[PDB]
């Protein structure tokens, strides 16, 4: 027994996976098929902030920090709650970007640690460490990587510390972890 009900579907962004050089401009357009007139809005996935309403979002003079989540919201005014979202991930070309430059760890001497290192950049970077040992790479954002390495607390490591080097085809960035002890 047939039914005709209200709906919104097929929320498409264009371009789908934008790659832009720093300083260039980007124009994102949202599209949706639905059973009435629609309203459109743009969000900044990492924050709640609304950017511009309507189907097109115009960005200019892109810095590195403009990359990542943008979410289009395709709503119906006449039906509260009837919408659908679609995420677009913009990639800015740049060298690796360390999540932390210098940070400090409190440890005990008969201990092994799982240290971590985050970085961002396009193309997606890779990370290496200055101590021997196989590290595991977890990709979690088409531009972000989290490297994990197990080290044993030794006197020479308390002396030097430990540093992860995130590399990509556009350059390299580094980050160091200090190790300090029990009181």
């Amino acid at each position, epitope marked *: 027994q047939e039914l005709l009900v209200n709906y919104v579907s097929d929320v498409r962004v264009s371009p789908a996976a934008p790659e832009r*050089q720093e300083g260039s401009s980007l124009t994102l357009t949202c599209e949706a098929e639905s059973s009435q007139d629609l309203e459109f809005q743009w969000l900044r996935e990492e924050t709640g902030q609304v950017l511009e309403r309507g189907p097109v979002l115009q960005l200019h003079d892109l810095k590195r920090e403009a990359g990542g989540g943008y979410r289009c919201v395709a709503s119906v005014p006449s039906i509260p709650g009837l919408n659908r979202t679609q995420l677009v991930n913009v990639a800015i070309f740049g060298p690796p970007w360390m999540a932390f430059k210098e940070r400090k760890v409190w440890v005990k001497e008969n201990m092994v640690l799982n240290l971590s290192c985050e970085a961002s950049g396009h193309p997606r970077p890779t990370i290496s460490w200055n101590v021997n040992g196989t590290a595991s790479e977890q990709d*979690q*954002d088409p531009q*972000r990587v989290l490297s994990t390495l197990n080290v044993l607390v030794t006197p020479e490591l308390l002396e030097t510390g430990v540093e992860c080097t995130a590399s990509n085809d556009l350059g390299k960035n580094t980050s160091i972890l200090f190790l300090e002890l029990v009181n």
Partner: antibody
Amino acid sequence: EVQLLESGAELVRPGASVKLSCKTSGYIFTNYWIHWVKQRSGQGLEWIARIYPGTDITYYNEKFKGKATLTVDKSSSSAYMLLSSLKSEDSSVYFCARSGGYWYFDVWGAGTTVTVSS
Amino acid sequence: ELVMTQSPASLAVSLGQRATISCRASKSVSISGYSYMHWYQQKPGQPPKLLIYLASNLESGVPARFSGSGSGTDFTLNIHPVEEEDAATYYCQHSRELPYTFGGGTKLEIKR
């Protein structure tokens, strides 16, 4: 319009080498990667290597290490591949292709035929 | 390395119906919501031509008859409704790891 133009067909003796060229136009040459693929007798596609013209950084397929050498001349906005110590199994068509940070090939060259024969 | 298995190798579909080509990777080429699988079309005498990038996105200039879908290991190129000019060989390719590999290829024959 983005254009990738490859050098002419080649006749090389076994054991000798050849330097294929790929002259680019229509885009900032230092902002895109250049890849080379091999297609033998019209079927199949092998990825050989890639080079970034901005920083001269190259990554090779381990199948082709010692066979291919990727060079770039930013003056003429051209990428080059050097095939070394040729034998009959190298007689194929070699394409150059452009790519971004996601490593998919939007534009391809016409293809240089290489014949390795005495 | 990372192998791509295309099925079938040959495909004969009548004009106006649908062609469904499959591509299975030995390892997942999807991470973080991106599926690094791409599709190409190759006509005789011509180089490969990009159809679909990142599993599902249509390249500008490619008619809406072409569509791609899938995730992880399983991907499918759909052509509907097939026209005469669609007679070609179709390849998948991944950009998840290095080295980049291609599928074996699928040649589409058009019934008339």
